[PDB]
Design a protein around this ligand. Structure first.
Ligand SMILES: O=C(COP(=O)(O)O)[C@H](O)[C@H](O)COP(=O)(O)O
Ligand SMILES: O=C(COP(=O)(O)O)[C@H](O)[C@H](O)COP(=O)(O)O
Ligand SMILES: O=C(COP(=O)(O)O)[C@H](O)[C@H](O)COP(=O)(O)O
Ligand SMILES: O=C(COP(=O)(O)O)[C@H](O)[C@H](O)COP(=O)(O)O
Ligand SMILES: O=C(COP(=O)(O)O)[C@H](O)[C@H](O)COP(=O)(O)O
Ligand SMILES: O=C(COP(=O)(O)O)[C@H](O)[C@H](O)COP(=O)(O)O
Ligand SMILES: [Mg+2]
Ligand SMILES: [Mg+2]
Lengths: 322, 321, 320, 325, 321, 322
C-alpha cells in the first residue's frame, strides 16, 4: 500500500468524472502509471512491480466497465510484465514502464490526426460522404480529405434525439465543406447518391462489431444494401475484449426527456412509454474497414489489435493481476 | 354540357376544399353520379358524350392525384362497357349511377375493411412497429385490439413533423400499450417486433410503395429480420406508373419543417437542408398489401388495377375517345 | 332433390369415395343425374332443385377441395345460362353438358399432366420427388417412355413411408432410383436437375399445400436454383389465402410416427406432433403442371376465375 | 549393465494407442483425453538424459498416437495441443527439466479442460437462451443437450422440439433423455422442421467436426434445418468442443453408411437392384447458416474457427506437424 | 385453295429473304390480309376455313420464329371471335383485314414508341450500359438524347460477332458519347452505371428474357448493384412457352464464329468450341419490359399474351380447329 | 552503396524486366540477399546487417508496384531483423538470412507443384471445371487432378482482350484434358453445368479480395449465385498488405489497341473512348478458398498469412527500413 499521490490524484479525477472521454481518460491513466514509475521509491524490481500493479489496479477499479481506460493500463502494464517476467532489473523495468506510457500518450494525442491521414487515403475526389452523430474521428477524415484538395460533399444525418448532426453540419460547414442536412429517416433514400459512409465508434467488440450512436446500424445496413464502402473511424484503445453475440441486453438506456421533453411528456398516458437507447450494435458484416491511428484493418482483425497493441489474451489474466 | 354540380365539386378538388385520397375519390365518383342523375340527354350517345366530358373536367383538376383518376376509371370503365355493348339510355345511366354508388359505399367502408383484413394476421401477443400516422395502419391495430388481442405497438417518431406523437396518443387512447422511440431506433428494436404495419400514400404498378420518408428503411431492416411486413392501402391508391429506379424526388417539402425558420437563418450558406416527403419501398420488402377487398402480394397490384379500374396497356382512358 | 344425388353425397360424407378426381367426377355426376331425372316443369323450379342438389353435396364434406370445384364448374355455367333467361330444357342441357365435360376432363387429367410435364424434362435429368403423387409420377413415367434417360431421387417421406411405394413403382418400370431419408434432401439437391412433386391443394396465390417435408425440399431447391414443378389438377386450386390468418392444416394420429406399443414405453411429458402437410411459398415453385397446361403460381387465381367462375365479390353459384 | 538404457516410447503410450485403434476407447473427449494423457505419461516416465533425446522420443510417442486413427478429429488436436507447446519450449532452448514440465503441464491443462468442456459449453450456450424459449434440435448431441439441460437448471422454462433424425432414430434417445430431466418435449418427423421453425426461438445442435471455414459437419439433415432456421432468422447455435475444429476443408461423400440402417435387410432383399439406398452419415452446414459455435472457451462466429485452430493448437499454414521433423 | 400473294410471302420468309422481328411478322400479317381481299368464298364458312389454311402455311414457313405466329395469332384470334360468333362473312372479311392493318401499323411505330416510353425512364446524366445491337434498345437511348438528356453509353463488345462495334459507331454518330469495353468489363463498370438497357430475342410466359449470350450476366451484376434494368421488346416477341430450368441450348451457332475455320483447323481434337447464341435472364433480374404499349413488370408477360394474342391455358391456335 | 555486385546485377535484370513472373522475381530477390550474405565484406554484426538492409532497399526500389518482390524481401529481412534484435552475432545472423533465403527459394520452386497437390484434393472425378485467363497455378490444379486419374473437363473462357484462353485451352488439351472453349459472356450460361471454379490471381488484398484479369469477378459472382465451389490458386508471396476494394480507381489501364486494332481504332470517332482495364476486384464473399503452397485457406485468412509469413503488422515498417 505505497501508491504515489499523483496516482490516487488522477484516479480521483477519473472516478469523479472530472476527466472525460476515451482519449483524455486513457492518457491520464497512462500518465498515472508513468508518475508512479518516475517517482517510485522501491529498492528492487520485485517490490517495484508491486507498486506498478497496485497503481494499475487502483485506476482500473474506478470504472472497471470502461473501455479506453483498461486499454491504457494494458498498454503500459503488458510491456512492463514482459520485461519483468523476462528478468529485467529495477531501473530497466522502470525505463520500460515510463517509455511505454509516454509512447502511449504521444500516440493518443496524435490519434485523430493520424486517423484522418489513413481515412483520407480511401476517400476519392468527387465523393459524397454520409455520416451520423458527431464524431471527431469521423470528422477528422473528412477535413483531411477536403484539405487534400479533394472535392467532396457530405450528407449529415440529423441524429435524433440530441441533434449532434447540427454540430457536424455547422462544423464541416466552417472548413468550407458543402453540407447537406437530412433527417435520420432519409438514410436509405440518399444512400443511392452516397459514395462513402464514414462514422465513429463508442467502442469496438472482439469480433469487430461497432457500438455507436443509435441509428448507426441502420445506415451501415442500407450501405451494405447499396454496396457503398463503409468505414468506421476509431482509435485502437476503443477496442473492447467483450463479445456481443451472447448477451442480449441493452447497452445504455437514457433519459426519456431527451426524446419527449418533461413539459410535454408529463401529459402522456401510462400506456405510452418512451425508450431512448443511446447506442445500437452494428454487425461486422456491414463494415468494410476500421480506421485506427496505426492504419486500416478489417473488422474481424479487432482481436489482433487487442493482442498486438494491448497484449490481451482470453487465456491470460490482466497484466496487473496476481 | 356538364351539370352545375359537377363543376362545383370539380372546383373544390382543384382549390382543395376536398382533400385526401378517400374524400377526393368519393367526391369525384359522386360528381359522375350527379351528371348521370341530372342529365337531360335523350340520346344514349349524347349522354355518353356528357359523361366523358364531365370525367375529363374532374380529371384535369388535380392531374397528379392518385385516387382521382381511379374513381373516374372505376365508374367510366363500367360505363364504357355498357355503352360499347349497345345498352340503352336507361341502362347506361343505371350502370353509371350504380357504379358510382358502389365505389362510394365501398370507399366509405375501405378503412374498416382493411382493418379486419389486416387483423387476421395479428396474433395475440404480437409486438407491432408502425411509422407516420396512417389511418389504414392504425385501423388494423385498433381492430386487432378490439378482437381481444393483447398487442404492443412500437411507434416511430417520424421526423420531421412528429406524426408519431399523434399515433401514440391515439393508440394509447384506445388503451393500447405504446412504446415510443425515435426513427433511428428502427433496426435496434426490430429484433423484438412481430409485425410491421404501415400505411401508403400510393402503390406503384410493381407493388413498390410510396410513403413518408424512412418507410423503406424500416421495411429494409424488417426483411433483414424476416419480420412480417404489411402495407395497409386502399385500392384507389394504386396507379399505372412506375416510380422506382430514378433519382427525381417525389415531393420536396419546405426545409423549415426540419430546421425552424428562426434557426435556419443562422447556419452558413454552404449547408443545404433537404426534406423529402417520401421514399420508395421496393416490393421485395413488403409481404402483403392490406386492401379493402382483401390481402394481396405486392406483385398482385397490377391485377387490382385490372379487376378494379379496368386498366390495361391501352393508351386510351375510359373517358378518352 | 333426386334419389341418386343423395346416395352419392353420402358416399362422400362417408368417405366411401376417396380421391381428388373420383370425388369431383362423382359430385359432377350427381348434378348430371339431377338435371337428367328432375321432373321440374318450371325453369325457376328446376334451378332450385339444382342449387339444393349442389348445396347438399357441398356440405357433405367441405374439407375436400375438388368437391366444391366440381360443383362450381357445373353450377357456374348453370347460373350464367339461367340468368340469361334460359328455358328449362336449355339450362338442363347446359348443366348435363358441363357435368359430362368436367368428368371427361378429370378422366384425362393425370395423362395430360404427365405430358405437359414430360415436355419440361430433359434426357439425363436427375429428378427429386416426395411422397407418392399420382400426378408427379405421371410426369416421370411419361418422360421415361419418351425415351428420356432419367434417374429419380425418392425421398422416404416419413411417417407413412410413401417413398417406398414411389421407389418400387418407378423402379419396376425400369427407372433407376436412389432412395434417401428425408433429411438428405439438401445434401442431394446439389446433384438434382429437377424437382417434381404433387399437391393436395393450391391456394389462390399459388402457395402449395402438400405432404410434410415438401416446403423444405422446395426451399433447398430454391437455394440451389433447381427447377421446381408442382403437378396438380385444376380442381385442386382453392380460393382461400395463406397470407391472412395462420391456418394449420390437419394433424394426424401420432401412432403414425411412433406405434402404440412403442409409444407406451415413453415418458408422459413427450408429445408426438404429426402434421399432414406444410405450406410451400409460391416463390419456391417455378411452374404448376395442370392437365390444361403449364402456368406460373401467380396465375392460380386466373384458373379459379376462368375454370370455376370463382370471384371475390361474388357468391357461390348454388347460393341465393 | 548398459546405462541410460531405456525404451524410447513408454509402454503406457503403446497400450493407450492400442486401446484407441481397437475402439476400446471412443468418443471425441475420451480419445483426446487419452492421447494427451499418453503424452503426459511419456513426459513423466522418459528415461532420457538430455533434452534432445527426450524431444525425439516425445515426437515418436506422438507419431505412434497420431497413426492409431487418422479419421478421428480430436486425436490429432490433443497431440497438437501438447506438442505445439512442447516445440515452443524446446526451440526456445529449454533444458530437460523445463521441457518435461511444459509438456506434463500442457497435457494436464488440456485434459482438465476436456473434462470440463461439456459443462462449460452448457453455460456459454445458456447465456443465449431465454425463459420460455422453444428450442429445436437434431440428432443426440451431448454438447447441445448440455446447453439445454443447463438452461433448464438456471430456472429458464424451455420446450424442445426434437427432430426424429432418421435413419438410426437418435431423436428417440434425445426425447427420452430430455423428458427425464423434466424438460417438455415435442417429437417430430425430420420433414416437419420448416413447418415448425416459425414457432422456434433457437436452434441448438451439435457437431462431428468444424472445418477451417467454420463449416459444420453433423448428422444428415442438420444443414437442412439450419437452412430453414436462416430463412426465419431463428438464432442458430452449434455446440462443439475446440478439439473438434479441423484444419481441412469440406465443400466423394463424407461417409456412406450401411443401407440396411434405412431399409432393414429382410425388406431390402425384396427390392429391385434397380433401387440404390444411399445413406450418407453427414451433410455439411455452411457457416452462413450458423450464428455462433458454442466452445468451452466461449461463443465465437463460425469464421473464427481458424483462430481457435491457431490459439489452441498452434496450427499455422506450415508443412509439418509439431511432432514431425 | 390458297392465294399466290400469301405463298409469295411464305417463300421469302421460308428462304430467309424477309428477315427481322418486325418485317417478318408484318409481312405475315399483310399476307393474312390479302387472302381476305382476294377471297372467292360464298359463305362465311368457306371463307374462314380458307384463311385458316393461310395461317397454317405462314406458320410452318418458320415455326422457330417468335413474331411469325404472333402476327397470325393477333388477326386469327379476333377473326375466330366473330366466326365463332357466327357473324356474317362480310363482317368477318372486315374484322380480319382491319385487324391486320392495325397490327401492321402498331408494328411500324413499335420502335419509335418503345423509344418514347423508355426515354421517360432515362434522365439527364444517366450512364447507360447495353449489350449486342438492339434497335429497340438503341431507340430508347436515341430518344432520351433527343429530349435534351445528357446521357453516356457503355457499349459491351458483345462477342463473338462484335455487335458492339455497330452499336458504338451508330450511337456516336447520333453524337452520343460512347465508352467501349470487353464483355468481361460489365461488372467492373456497373459501379458507375445508372441504367441497364437491353433488347430481347424473345420473352417467355414467366417474363424470362432470351437474348444474345452475356445479357443474363449483365442483368445479374446489375441486380447485384441495384441498377434499374429495362428490356426493350415488342409485344409480338412474347411467346406462350417456358425456357428456364433447361439444359438444352436455345440455338448453338457456327463455332468458326468464335474461332475462324483456318485457325480452328489447327487446334487439338480434344477441344470443342461452343457458341450458344443466347442465354436466359430470370425475370427477377429485370425491373420492367418496355413494350410499344407501355412499361410492364416481367411477370405481366402472361397478360400481354392473353390480351394481345388471345392466349388461353388450354390453348389451340385459332387457325387450327 | 556498399553492396556486392551480384546483388546489383539481379536488380538490374528486375528493373529492366528481364525476369518476369511473381515466382521468378521473388526467387531472384531472395537469392540476391543470399549472395549478399554469402560474399559479405563485413566483419561485425551491425556492418553485415546494415549492408543487408542497404541491399534490400535497392532490390525493393527496382519496381515499387511488384507484389512478390517486397514479400521475398520481407520474408528474409523479417527473420533476419528478428535474429538481429535478439543480439544475434555477426557469423550467425548470416546463417539466418541464408537459411531464410534458401528456404524461400526452395518453397517457391515447389510452389506451383504443391498448389497443384492441395487443389487436386478438392477436385473430384467427373468434375466440370471453369477457369479464366492463363494461370499457371490454376492450370497446375487441373493438371495434377488429371494425373491422379480424375476424369475432368475444363471449360476455358476466351478472356478478351488478349485471348489468354487460347493458350489455356491448347495447353490443357495437350495434357489430354477435354476442353470446352467459350466466349467470356457465356460464363453464367454454363455455370449451370460447372462443378468447380478454379482461377488464379495477380495479387490478394488484406481483405482476401482477389485482383485478377478482368472478368474474374463476374465469373465468381455467377458462381456464387449457383453455389458452385470457387477456388483461387495463388502463392503466399502474392498477398498484398493494402486495400483495393471500395474504390472507383482503376487497378491498371491498358493499351486501348489491345481491344481494337490500331488500323481500326483510328477510323473510329473521337466521342468514343475505349477502356481496357487490366483487372477487376473479386470480393472475398465470392471466393470459398484460396489454394497456396502452404495449404488451402479461407480468403479472410489473407491477413494471417501476411503476419506469419512476411511479419506484417500495423506497427509495421519494412524490415530493411527503420
Ligand atoms: O455515438 C457517439 C457518442 O454519443 P454521445 O456523445 O451522445 O455519448 C459518437 O458517434 C462516437 O462516440 C464518436 O467517437 P469520437 O467523438 O471519439 O470520434
Ligand atoms: O405518409 C403518410 C402521411 O404523410 P403526410 O401526412 O405528410 O402527407 C401516410 O403513411 C399515408 O398518407 C397513408 O395514411 P392514411 O392511412 O391515413 O391514408
Ligand atoms: O400429399 C399427398 C397425399 O398425402 P396423403 O396420402 O397422406 O393424404 C400428395 O402429394 C398429394 O395428395 C398429391 O398426390 P396425387 O397426385 O396422387 O393426387
Ligand atoms: O452427428 C452426431 C452423431 O453421429 P453418430 O452417433 O451417427 O456417430 C452428433 O450430432 C455429433 O457427433 C455431436 O455429438 P456430441 O455433442 O455428443 O459430440
Ligand atoms: O441479340 C440480339 C440479336 O442477335 P442476332 O442478330 O445475332 O440474332 C438482339 O439483342 C435482339 O434481337 C433484340 O434486338 P432488336 O431490338 O433489333 O430486335
Ligand atoms: O491475370 C493474370 C495475368 O494477367 P497478365 O498476364 O495479362 O498480366 C493471371 O490470372 C494471374 O497473373 C495469375 O496467374 P499465375 O498463376 O500464372 O501467376
Ligand atoms: Mg393475373
Ligand atoms: Mg485472425
Amino acid at each position: 500500500m505505497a501508491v504515489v499521490k499523483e496516482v490516487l490524484e488522477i484516479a480521483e479525477k477519473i472516478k469523479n468524472m472530472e476527466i472525460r472521454g476515451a482519449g483524455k481518460i486513457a492518457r491520464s491513466a497512462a500518465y498515472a502509471l508513468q508518475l508512479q514509475a518516475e517517482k517510485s521509491k522501491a529498492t528492487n524490481v520485485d517490490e517495484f512491480w508491486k507498486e506498478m500493479k497496485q497503481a494499475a489496479k487502483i485506476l482500473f477499479e474506478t470504472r472497471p466497465t470502461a473501455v479506453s481506460l483498461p486499454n491504457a493500463l494494458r498498454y503500459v502494464m503488458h510491456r512492463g510484465k514482459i520485461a519483468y517476467s523476462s528478468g529485467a532489473d529495477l531501473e530497466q523495468l522502470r525505463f520500460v514502464i515510463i517509455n511505454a506510457a509516454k509512447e502511449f500518450i504521444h500516440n493518443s494525442e496524435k490519434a485523430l490526426e493520424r486517423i484522418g491521414e489513413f481515412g483520407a487515403k480511401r476517400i476519392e475526389d468527387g465523393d459524397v460522404i454520409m455520416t451520423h452523430c458527431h464524431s471527431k474521428a469521423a470528422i477528422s477524415v473528412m477535413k483531411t480529405a477536403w484539405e487534400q484538395g479533394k472535392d467532396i460533399k457530405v450528407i449529415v444525418t440529423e441524429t435524433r434525439p440530441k441533434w449532434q448532426g447540427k454540430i457536424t453540419a455547422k462544423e464541416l460547414a466552417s472548413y468550407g465543406i458543402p453540407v447537406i442536412y437530412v433527417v435520420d429517416s432519409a438514410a436509405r433514400h440518399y444512400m443511392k447518391m452516397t459514395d462513402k459512409v464514414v462514422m465513429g465508434a463508442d467502442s469496438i467488440t472482439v469480433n469487430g462489431a461497432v457500438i455507436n450512436k443509435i441509428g448507426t446500424a441502420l445506415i451501415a445496413l442500407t450501405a451494405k444494401e447499396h454496396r457503398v464502402w463503409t468505414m468506421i473511424a476509431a482509435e485502437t484503445y476503443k477496442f473492447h475484449p467483450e463479445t456481443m453475440l451472447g448477451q442480449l441486453v441493452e447497452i445504455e438506456m437514457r433519459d426519456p426527456t431527451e426524446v419527449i421533453p418533461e413539459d410535454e411528456l408529463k401529459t402522456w398516458p401510462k400506456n405510452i412509454e418512451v425508450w431512448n437507447p443511446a447506442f445500437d450494435v452494428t454487425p461486422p458484416e456491414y463494415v468494410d474497414v476500421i480506421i485506427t491511428e496505426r492504419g486500416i484493418i478489417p473488422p474481424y482483425a479487432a482481436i489482433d489489435i487487442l493482442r498486438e497493441e494491448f497484449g490481451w489474451a482470453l487465456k491470460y489474466t490482466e497484466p496487473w493481476e496476481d
